[PDB]
Amino acid sequence: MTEYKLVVVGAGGVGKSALTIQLIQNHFVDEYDPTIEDSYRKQVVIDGETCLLDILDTAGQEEYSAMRDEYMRTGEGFLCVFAINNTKSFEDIHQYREQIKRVKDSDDVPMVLVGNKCDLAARTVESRQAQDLARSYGIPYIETSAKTRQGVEDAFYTLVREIRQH
Amino acid sequence: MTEYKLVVVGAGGVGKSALTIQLIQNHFVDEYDPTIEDSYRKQVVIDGETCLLDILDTAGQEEYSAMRDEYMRTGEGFLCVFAINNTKSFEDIHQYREQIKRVKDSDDVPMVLVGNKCDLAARTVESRQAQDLARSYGIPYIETSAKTRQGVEDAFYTLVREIRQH
Amino acid sequence: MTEYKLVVVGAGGVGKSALTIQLIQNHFVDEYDPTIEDSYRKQVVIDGETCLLDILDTAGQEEYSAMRDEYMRTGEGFLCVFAINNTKSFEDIHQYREQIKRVKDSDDVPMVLVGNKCDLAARTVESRQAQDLARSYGIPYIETSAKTRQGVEDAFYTLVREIRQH
Amino acid sequence: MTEYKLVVVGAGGVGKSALTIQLIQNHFVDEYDPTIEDSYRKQVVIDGETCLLDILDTAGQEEYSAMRDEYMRTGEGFLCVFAINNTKSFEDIHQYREQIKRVKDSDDVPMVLVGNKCDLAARTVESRQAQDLARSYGIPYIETSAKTRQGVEDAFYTLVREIRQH
Amino acid sequence: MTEYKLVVVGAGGVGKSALTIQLIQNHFVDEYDPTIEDSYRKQVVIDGETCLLDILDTAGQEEYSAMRDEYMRTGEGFLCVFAINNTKSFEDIHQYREQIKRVKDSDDVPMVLVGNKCDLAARTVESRQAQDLARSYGIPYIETSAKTRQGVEDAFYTLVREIRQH
Amino acid sequence: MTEYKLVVVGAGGVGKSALTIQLIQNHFVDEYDPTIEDSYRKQVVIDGETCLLDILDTAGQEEYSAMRDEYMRTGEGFLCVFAINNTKSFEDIHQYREQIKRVKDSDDVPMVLVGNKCDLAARTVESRQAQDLARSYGIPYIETSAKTRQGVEDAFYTLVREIRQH
Ligand SMILES: Nc1nc2c(ncn2[C@@H]2O[C@H](COP(=O)(O)OP(=O)(O)NP(=O)(O)O)[C@@H](O)[C@H]2O)c(=O)[nH]1
Ligand SMILES: Nc1nc2c(ncn2[C@@H]2O[C@H](COP(=O)(O)OP(=O)(O)NP(=O)(O)O)[C@@H](O)[C@H]2O)c(=O)[nH]1
Ligand SMILES: Nc1nc2c(ncn2[C@@H]2O[C@H](COP(=O)(O)OP(=O)(O)NP(=O)(O)O)[C@@H](O)[C@H]2O)c(=O)[nH]1
Ligand SMILES: Nc1nc2c(ncn2[C@@H]2O[C@H](COP(=O)(O)OP(=O)(O)NP(=O)(O)O)[C@@H](O)[C@H]2O)c(=O)[nH]1
Ligand SMILES: Nc1nc2c(ncn2[C@@H]2O[C@H](COP(=O)(O)OP(=O)(O)NP(=O)(O)O)[C@@H](O)[C@H]2O)c(=O)[nH]1
Ligand SMILES: Nc1nc2c(ncn2[C@@H]2O[C@H](COP(=O)(O)OP(=O)(O)NP(=O)(O)O)[C@@H](O)[C@H]2O)c(=O)[nH]1
Ligand SMILES: [Ca+2]
Ligand SMILES: [Ca+2]
Ligand SMILES: [Ca+2]
Ligand SMILES: [Ca+2]
Ligand SMILES: [Ca+2]
Ligand SMILES: [Ca+2]
Ligand SMILES: [Ca+2]
Ligand SMILES: [Ca+2]
Ligand SMILES: [Ca+2]
Ligand SMILES: [Mg+2]
Ligand SMILES: [Mg+2]
Ligand SMILES: [Mg+2]
Ligand SMILES: [Mg+2]
Ligand SMILES: [Mg+2]
Ligand SMILES: [Mg+2]
Ligand SMILES: [Mg+2]
Ligand SMILES: [Mg+2]
Ligand SMILES: [Mg+2]
Ligand SMILES: [Mg+2]
Ligand SMILES: [Mg+2]
Ligand SMILES: [Mg+2]
């Protein structure tokens, strides 16, 4: 059984925890409790391979972000999450990518760009803009909703498929 | 490092998930999303011993309870949870204990009786009544609030201390 | 290398130990020493797979049967043995199956029904009667002689082949 | 948990198997079935240490002795067994010790000399004669009966205590 | 058995390989063959603890230094080596420390400053100057000669003792 | 990942260490420092299989040869090395083969005969003479130079290919 260590990063409130909990526990967390550092483990079959996902759900609030770098350092692949109704969270992605490069000491780290909250209509980040950012990084862009489950499995399983290309 | 497998059982809505999430993630879940079967892992030091807790959070809703027995079978100790404002959940404890005895094939299984929601004032189960039930089973009774954290560490760590007496 | 944990159960004197010793050590035990709980381990190739058999030989005498359930609980597949010259041992099978279901908490446990001592002529259980019992359980019936080796490998290897269908 | 690999060697018929079976299974084998190569495993507490004994019961009959050296090579300590009513088996000990030295490539191998069948009265090897042989090898001499259990635990546990001095 | 991963870094020609080979193989390498990336493993008892040292001997020549950072990243403690007859190698230490901080993402990494070639008399780095540098980093300074063995065990074992304080 | 334990034996000065260091570290050791007992480990892909080579470089000088047999005992395959400009080292091979047979207690041990220093012209052992010796042992003969790298990978990888035929 193969183990994949995935790390979910991005600004406070973008839905990192809700995405992870939807994937692992199959329900939507409606309330907002800021995360420090939480981990989840689940055995799943992905493309015919039985494997063990260890998912680290990290803090996006600056106040709660103590030692986040020590956690990010352990990851094999990163979901870089912004919310499509939060322009600042999209602009912040650059800084999370720089932190990832820093903690892995590599310019070649498996990553997927995720635009979450796609069930909401106050979109300020258009798909094409995010596609362009992801293209500049050489990674896929996927839209998700932790509320409806749209794209959730695809985002996480795509990250595993990116780690496998590394 | 020693591993302890703990299983949290009890009627729907009594606060099994909220207790587990408060212990592992240090926040209170205010909303009610019924659980199927979720697991959590955390390394903690308990009485000077570094150990790994694997906590299984089980379904209390009959509808979601498919295969709960297959999960309970793996446990080394059980938190049997009722809510102090839910007389039926207290009366139900007998049936959870019988299920535990069934799946472990033993009359001697480490267990703690937990009266949760002790922050609420619509108490219908008095402390002495629960103490008496626990005494009949030869186990401790502890009151908790997942909301205020009262008793939460004590309940889980007491269960580890009971497993160590086995 | 795959490990299969096999458990041999059945009434006192039916030949559980003699079957196990013939398989593992290639000789026939002529004397009768009642078993408490013995274990055997052997690496064998079964259908091209190298694997490790752990065989638990259990007590059939009521007097020696203390804690048999604790041993049966660990098994992945069960040989349920009666002797073809012992009608009572055949009638007892029902009770061993019920115990297996109890300790595994499943109605779907890999099992093979074994009619031992087929080298003897005081047959009181006819093949068709045992075939019918096994059919009702959804399992194979195989006749063996620990004395001549007839059916011995087939019985144990069939049990492995049943575990593989589970 | 510490593992000790013990090997039992000596002439055909001296009681190697009966000693091993008495230790592991707590009964006396009255019949004589010559051994090829059999192994037994048991967890036991010896002087407060929980450990795993792997006991190899070897062939003493020349006819069955094919590849015995390949088995002896793996052992950490050896019980060198003769029978007190079989002078030839005592005279043969020299050759088993030479084989042990050969397969371990050492003149310093943990060993115990065992005079078995001490329940029988046709003694042709007197205690003092065996004590002298053991003294020349720098090892203990212990008398045993697989039939009455006299000395059986002492012989095997003494061998573990000799391995611990190595 | 505890494993310590040690990494030896410093300018080309300062004696990293000679130090490591003297420790592990007990001879002095007189010739100069520039290293790419070599590893050594040895079980040793240090202060009563049996442990496994994995020592990574890295390139100091810029030409051979491809991917050195990927190797340094794995280390638990670093020997930062300069030669006492090579002022430039001492001035270079700052840059190796910065690289270590970079690859470990920490300002608190176990390290020892080593002034090698102390058997030579063309000293251009005085002890006090190196002591001052080490003091500024909060680490020990030790002088060594790979040729005479002076200080060699002390340097490596001191690094283990620093890792144990971390 | 498969592990192969290789042991390099032969007379003092024939180039055992130089061969091993050329394979593992890709440089030529020009000086002569007699070996006691050194070990090297490297992960390599051989015929599409990722594996771990553990190479034991042994003493050829009689003075340094204490306990060489204890080291040789652990090996899965042996490189038996002589130098093509050292007739005595070739005549000595017989004795190393006898020692190998002794420590492995087998007449069937994976081995390759290696004629090293083939870059030198003072040849006193002709290829055909060594081919004949190897033929009598049922093993390959390969010529090497640790100085030029000729045959070095072939010798070690051939030994792995011989172990795989065992
Ligand atoms: N409509 C909608 N709301 C969402 C979605 N994902 C998250 N939310 C909501 O957004 C809020 C924040 O979600 P959360 O997952 O806690 O965010 P986070 O990124 O983990 N925050 P932090 O970094 O502070 O831990 C919650 O109220 C949650 O319900 C989504 O896809 N759609
Ligand atoms: N005031 C208060 N509310 C609590 C406490 N524990 C849980 N609750 C609330 O009770 C509801 C049910 O909690 P939850 O933990 O989901 O219950 P559960 O036992 O896991 N239910 P299920 O068996 O269906 O999974 C939630 O609204 C939660 O906030 C507590 O200690 N105090
Ligand atoms: N003729 C014949 N005798 C057999 C056969 N199998 C066992 N026996 C004999 O039946 C007796 C009991 O055998 P044994 O294997 O000890 O039975 P068991 O089922 O292990 N008994 P227990 O439950 O008390 O341990 C012995 O005398 C043995 O030789 C067989 O196939 N044929
Ligand atoms: N009276 C008595 N008989 C014994 C004792 N130990 C063994 N025997 C008997 O001696 C015979 C041979 O015993 P066994 O253990 O098979 O000998 P072995 O050394 O294992 N023989 P092999 O080398 O051929 O496998 C059996 O009949 C057994 O009952 C003992 O302590 N006392
Ligand atoms: N006198 C003396 N010479 C030394 C000492 N240590 C190393 N040398 C010599 O200095 C030269 C370089 O040594 P080496 O260990 O190869 O250096 P390095 O730091 O590993 N070099 P690189 O970074 O290129 O691999 C060799 O000629 C070696 O003998 C020492 O303590 N004293
Ligand atoms: N020209 C040449 N010299 C070689 C070759 N292999 C080794 N040498 C030289 O021969 C000497 C001895 O080499 P070394 O590898 O130390 O031999 P060894 O067999 O390991 N000796 P020991 O048994 O004492 O450890 C060194 O000077 C080395 O450079 C080779 O292929 N060609
Ligand atoms: Ca919800
Ligand atoms: Ca970094
Ligand atoms: Ca909350
Ligand atoms: Ca017999
Ligand atoms: Ca049961
Ligand atoms: Ca008997
Ligand atoms: Ca030998
Ligand atoms: Ca030298
Ligand atoms: Ca060189
Ligand atoms: Mg969060
Ligand atoms: Mg816009
Ligand atoms: Mg729940
Ligand atoms: Mg009341
Ligand atoms: Mg039996
Ligand atoms: Mg009838
Ligand atoms: Mg025997
Ligand atoms: Mg006499
Ligand atoms: Mg070097
Ligand atoms: Mg100066
Ligand atoms: Mg050498
Ligand atoms: Mg000639």
Q: Phi and psi at residue B117, in whole multiples of 5°?
A: 70, 35
Instruction: Report the C-alpha gap between C157 and C164 in whole angstroms.
Output: 11
CB–CB contact F31 E30 (8 Å): yes
Please indicate whether residue D151, judged by its CB atom, sits closer than 6 Å to ligand 4: no
CA nearest to B74, candidates B134, B9, B22: B9
Q: Is F122 helix (H, G, I), strand (E, B) or coil?
A: coil
Instruction: Report the C-alpha gap between D58 and F89 in whole angstroms.
Output: 41
Integer CA distances (angstroms), B141 to B114, B133, B156, in order: 6, 8, 12
Query: Encoding tokens for residue B36?
Result: 């199927």
Angle of helix A16-25 relative to helix A152-163, nearest 10 degrees, comes to: 90
Q: How many CA atoms lie within 13 A of E30 on its CB side?
A: 4
Contact F114, F90 (CB under 8 A): no
Instruction: Report the C-alpha gap between F113 and F131 in whole angstroms.
Output: 9
- In terms of Cβ atoms closer than 10 Å to its own Cβ (0-12, 13-18, 19+), residue C111 is buried
Instruction: Give me Rg for the CA atoms of chain E.
Output: 14
Q: Is F117 annotated as a binding residue?
A: yes
Instruction: Report the C-alpha gap between A123 and A86 in whole angstroms.
Output: 8
> D97 has which bridge partners?
none
Instruction: Report the C-alpha gap between F28 and F12 in whole angstroms.
Output: 17
The minimal CB distance from C31 to the residues D24, D30, D39 is found for D30
CA nearest to C36, candidates C70, C5, C87, C84: C70
Q: Phi and psi at residue F130, in whole multiples of 5°?
A: -70, -40
Contact F81, F114 (CB under 8 A): yes
Q: Enumerate the residues of chain B whose CB falls inside 8 A of the CB of residue A42.
A: 39
Distance from the alpha carbon of residue F81 to the mean position of ligand 6, in angstroms: 11
Supply the DSSP symbol for E3: E
Instruction: Report the C-alpha gap between E9 and A120 in whole angstroms.
Output: 54
Angle of helix B152-163 relative to helix B16-25, nearest 10 degrees, comes to: 90
Neighbours of D (≥3 Cβ pairs closer than 8 A)? Answer: C, F
CB–CB contact A25 B38 (8 Å): yes
Written as one letter, the residue type at E81 is V
Q: Is A27 helix (H, G, I), strand (E, B) or coil?
A: coil
CA nearest to E89, candidates E117, E119, E128: E117
Q: In which order are the strands placed within the sheet that holds B37-46?
A: B37-46, B49-58, B2-10, B77-83, B111-116, B141-143
Contact A18, A28 (CB under 8 A): yes
Q: Resolution reached, in Å? A: 1.4
Instruction: Report the C-alpha gap between C133 and F30 in whole angstroms.
Output: 80
Supply the DSSP symbol for A62: G
Beta-strand relationship, B37-46 and C2-10: unpaired
Instruction: Report the C-alpha gap between D146 and D18 in whole angstroms.
Output: 6
Contact E117, E149 (CB under 8 A): no
Instruction: Give me Rg for the CA atoms of chain D.
Output: 14
Instruction: Report the C-alpha gap between D8 and D25 in whole angstroms.
Output: 16
F vs E contact (3+ beta-carbon pairs below 8 A): yes
Please indicate whether residue C77, judged by its CB atom, sits closer than 6 Å to ligand 3: no
Instruction: Report the C-alpha gap between D27 and C134 in whole angstroms.
Output: 34
List CB contacts of A94: < 8 A, sequence separation 6 or more. Answer: none
Instruction: Report the C-alpha gap between B158 and B46 in whole angstroms.
Output: 10
Instruction: Report the C-alpha gap between D127 and D140 in whole angstroms.
Output: 12
Contact A137, A97 (CB under 8 A): yes
Contact C148, C93 (CB under 8 A): no
- What are F121-127's contacts with CB under 8 Å, separation 24+? F122/F85, F123/F84, F123/F85, F124/F84, F124/F85, F124/F86, F124/F87, F125/F82, F125/F84, F125/F85, F125/F86, F125/F87, F125/F90
CB–CB contact A29 B30 (8 Å): no
Instruction: Report the C-alpha gap between A143 and A139 in whole angstroms.
Output: 13
Q: Phi and psi at residue F145, in whole multiples of 5°?
A: -135, 115
Distance from the alpha carbon of residue C154 to the mean position of ligand 8, in angstroms: 60
Contact A8, A56 (CB under 8 A): yes
Distance from the alpha carbon of residue F87 to the mean position of ligand 27, in angstroms: 9
Integer CA distances (angstroms), C35 to A104, B40, C118, D25, in order: 60, 42, 22, 8
CA nearest to D119, candidates D150, D74, D73, D88: D150
Chain F residue closest in CA terms to D105:
F103
Ligand nearest the Cα atom of residue D127: 23
Q: How many CA atoms lie within 13 A of D20 on its CB side?
A: 27
CB–CB contact E25 F41 (8 Å): no
The dihedral region occupied by A151, where left means phi > 0, alpha psi between -120 and 50, and beta the remainder, is left
Q: Is F11 annotated as a binding residue?
A: yes
Beta-strand relationship, F37-46 and F49-58: antiparallel
Contact D140, D162 (CB under 8 A): yes
Q: Phi and psi at residue E75, in whole multiples of 5°?
A: -75, 150
Angle of helix D16-25 relative to helix D152-163, nearest 10 degrees, comes to: 90
Distance from the alpha carbon of residue C101 to the mean position of ligand 8, in angstroms: 56
Residue F31 touches chain D, beta carbons under 8 Å: no
Beta-strand relationship, B141-143 and C37-46: unpaired
Count of beta carbons in the 10 Å neighbourhood of residue F75: 25
What sign does the CA torsion over F57, F63, F65, F66 have? negative
CA nearest to F95, candidates F120, F126, F72, F123: F72
- In terms of Cβ atoms closer than 10 Å to its own Cβ (0-12, 13-18, 19+), residue F27 is middle
Please indicate whether residue B27, judged by its CB atom, sits closer than 6 Å to ligand 2: no
Supply the DSSP symbol for E10: E
CB–CB contact B27 A39 (8 Å): no
CB–CB contact D70 F102 (8 Å): no
Ligand 2, atom 26, lies closest to the CA of: B32
* Parent domain of F110: 1-166
Query: Encoding tokens for residue B138?
Result: 């030869």
Concatenated DSSP letters for chain B? Answer: -EEEEEEEEESTTSSHHHHHHHHHHSS---S----SEEEEEEEEEETTEEEEEEEEEE--SGGG-TTHHHHHTT-SEEEEEEETT-HHHHHTHHHHHHHHHHHHT-S---EEEEEE-TT-S---S-HHHHHHHHHHHT--EEE--TTT-TTHHHHHHHHHHHHTT-
- In terms of Cβ atoms closer than 10 Å to its own Cβ (0-12, 13-18, 19+), residue F128 is exposed
Contact F6, F78 (CB under 8 A): yes
C vs D contact (3+ beta-carbon pairs below 8 A): yes
Neighbours of C (≥3 Cβ pairs closer than 8 A)? Answer: B, D
User: What residues of E form the annotated binding site for GTP?
Assistant: 10-17, 57-61, 116-119
List CB contacts of F113: < 8 A, sequence separation 6 or more. Answer: F80, F82, F93, F130, F133, F134, F137, F139, F140, F141, F142
Contact C18, C146 (CB under 8 A): yes
Instruction: Report the C-alpha gap between F55 and F36 in whole angstroms.
Output: 14
Query: Encoding tokens for residue C96?
Result: 């061993």
Instruction: Report the C-alpha gap between E75 and E39 in whole angstroms.
Output: 12
Token pair 């049943």: residue: C162
Beta-strand relationship, C111-116 and A77-83: unpaired
Token pair 């005498």: residue: C61
Q: Determine which of B73, B103, B105 to mutate to test the interface with C (most C C-beta atoms within 10 Å).
A: B105
Written as one letter, the residue type at E51 is C
Contact F3, F52 (CB under 8 A): yes
Distance from the alpha carbon of residue D105 to the mean position of ligand 13, in angstroms: 5
Query: Encoding tokens for residue E25?
Result: 């193989």
The minimal CB distance from C36 to the residues D26, D38, D41 is found for D26
Contact C78, C67 (CB under 8 A): no
CA nearest to E23, candidates E36, E38, E11, E41: E41
Cα angle: D42, vertex D48, D54; to 5 degrees:
20
- What are C37-46's contacts with CB under 8 Å, separation 24+? C37/C67, C37/C68, C37/C71, C38/D24, C38/D25, C39/D41, C39/D42, C40/D40, C41/D39, C41/D41, C42/D39, C43/C1, C46/C157, C46/C160, C46/C161
Chain B residue closest in CA terms to A37:
B25
Instruction: Report the C-alpha gap between F49 and F52 in whole angstroms.
Output: 10
Instruction: Report the C-alpha gap between C19 and C153 in whole angstroms.
Output: 9
Concatenated DSSP letters for F34-98? Answer: --SEEEEEEEEEETTEEEEEEEEEE--SGGG-TTHHHHHTT-SEEEEEEETT-HHHHHTHHHHHH
Instruction: Report the C-alpha gap between A70 and D159 in whole angstroms.
Output: 51
Tell which A residues from 34 to 73 touch E, by Cβ distance under 8 Å.
69-70, 73
Q: How many domains does chain C have?
A: 1
Instruction: Report the C-alpha gap between E51 and E45 in whole angstroms.
Output: 6
CA nearest to F81, candidates F158, F12, F34: F12
Query: Encoding tokens for residue B165?
Result: 């007496």
Query: Encoding tokens for residue B83?
Result: 């809510």
Ligand nearest the Cα atom of residue D109: 13
Written as one letter, the residue type at D16 is K
Q: Which alpha helices (DSSP H) does A5-52 contain, by range?
A: 16-25
- Residue F120: enclosing H or E segment and its boundaries? none
Q: How far is CA B77 from the centre of its chain?
A: 9
Instruction: Report the C-alpha gap between C29 and C13 in whole angstroms.
Output: 12
Q: How many CA atoms lie within 13 A of E65 on its CB side?
A: 12
Query: Encoding tokens for residue C155?
Result: 């019985």
CB–CB contact D31 C30 (8 Å): yes
Count of beta carbons in the 10 Å neighbourhood of residue F54: 17
Instruction: Report the C-alpha gap between C152 and D6 in whole angstroms.
Output: 29
Ligand 2, atom 13, lies closest to the CA of: B15
Instruction: Report the C-alpha gap between F5 and F56 in whole angstroms.
Output: 8
Q: Enumerate the residues of chain C whose CB falls inside 8 A of the CB of residue D31.
A: 29-31
Neighbours of F (≥3 Cβ pairs closer than 8 A)? Answer: D, E
Contact E119, E145 (CB under 8 A): yes
Contact C150, C117 (CB under 8 A): no
Q: How far is CA E73 from the centre of its chain?
A: 15
Q: Is A67 helix (H, G, I), strand (E, B) or coil?
A: coil
Q: Is A17 annotated as a binding residue?
A: yes
CB–CB contact D30 C35 (8 Å): no
Supply the DSSP symbol for E165: T
Instruction: Report the C-alpha gap between B56 and B7 in whole angstroms.
Output: 5
Q: In which order are the strands placed within the sheet that holds E141-143?
A: E37-46, E49-58, E2-10, E77-83, E111-116, E141-143
Count of beta carbons in the 10 Å neighbourhood of residue A35: 20
Contact B2, B52 (CB under 8 A): yes
Q: Phi and psi at residue E116, in whole multiples of 5°?
A: -95, 170
Instruction: Report the C-alpha gap between A102 and A69 in whole angstroms.
Output: 9
CB–CB contact A41 B39 (8 Å): yes
CB–CB contact C103 B102 (8 Å): no
Beta-strand relationship, D49-58 and E37-46: unpaired
D vs B contact (3+ beta-carbon pairs below 8 A): no
Concatenated DSSP letters for chain D? Answer: -EEEEEEEEESTTSSHHHHHHHHHHSS---S----SEEEEEEEEEETTEEEEEEEEEE--SGGG-TTHHHHHTT-SEEEEEEETT-HHHHHTHHHHHHHHHHHHT-S---EEEEEE-TT-S---S-HHHHHHHHHHHT--EEE--TTT-TTHHHHHHHHHHHHTT-
Q: Return the residues preceding each gap in chain F, C–N over 2.5 A, or none.
A: none
- In terms of Cβ atoms closer than 10 Å to its own Cβ (0-12, 13-18, 19+), residue B8 is buried
Supply the DSSP symbol for F110: -
CA D5 to chain C, closest CA, distance in angstroms equals: 15
CB–CB contact C27 D38 (8 Å): no
Please indicate whether residue B148, judged by its CB atom, sits closer than 6 Å to ligand 2: no
Ligand nearest the Cα atom of residue C28: 10
Q: Is A86 helix (H, G, I), strand (E, B) or coil?
A: coil
Q: Is D15 annotated as a binding residue?
A: yes
Name the method of structure determination.
X-ray
Instruction: Give me Rg for the CA atoms of chain C.
Output: 14
Token pair 């080593």: residue: E114
Q: Enumerate the residues of chain E whose CB falls inside 8 A of the CB of residue F63.
A: none
Query: Encoding tokens for residue A17?
Result: 């925890």
F vs C contact (3+ beta-carbon pairs below 8 A): no
Q: Is F9 helix (H, G, I), strand (E, B) or coil?
A: strand
Neighbours of E (≥3 Cβ pairs closer than 8 A)? Answer: A, F
Q: How far is CA B161 from the centre of its chain?
A: 14
Q: How far is CA B139 from the centre of its chain?
A: 13
Chain D residue closest in CA terms to C43:
D39
Q: Enumerate the residues of chain C whose CB falls inside 8 A of the CB of residue B105.
A: 69-70, 73, 102-103
Written as one letter, the residue type at F29 is V
Strands (E), chain A: 2-10, 37-46, 49-58, 77-83, 111-116, 141-143
End-to-end Cα, chain E, rounded Å: 18
Contact A111, A97 (CB under 8 A): yes
CB–CB contact C38 D24 (8 Å): yes
Instruction: Report the C-alpha gap between E138 and B98 in whole angstroms.
Output: 61
Count of beta carbons in the 10 Å neighbourhood of residue D1: 7
Chain A residue closest in CA terms to E100:
A105
Indicate which CATH number applies to the domain containing B102.
Answer: 3.40.50.300
Contact C11, C88 (CB under 8 A): yes
Instruction: Report the C-alpha gap between E133 and B17 in whole angstroms.
Output: 54
Q: Return the residues preceding each gap in chain E, C–N over 2.5 A, or none.
A: none
> E82 has which bridge partners?
E115
Distance from the alpha carbon of residue B57 to the mean position of ligand 2, in angstroms: 12
Number of cross-chain residue pairs from A and B with Cβ atoms under 8 Å apart: 30
List CB contacts of A150: < 8 A, sequence separation 6 or more. Answer: A118, A119, A143, A144
Residue E95 touches chain F, beta carbons under 8 Å: no
- In terms of Cβ atoms closer than 10 Å to its own Cβ (0-12, 13-18, 19+), residue A20 is buried
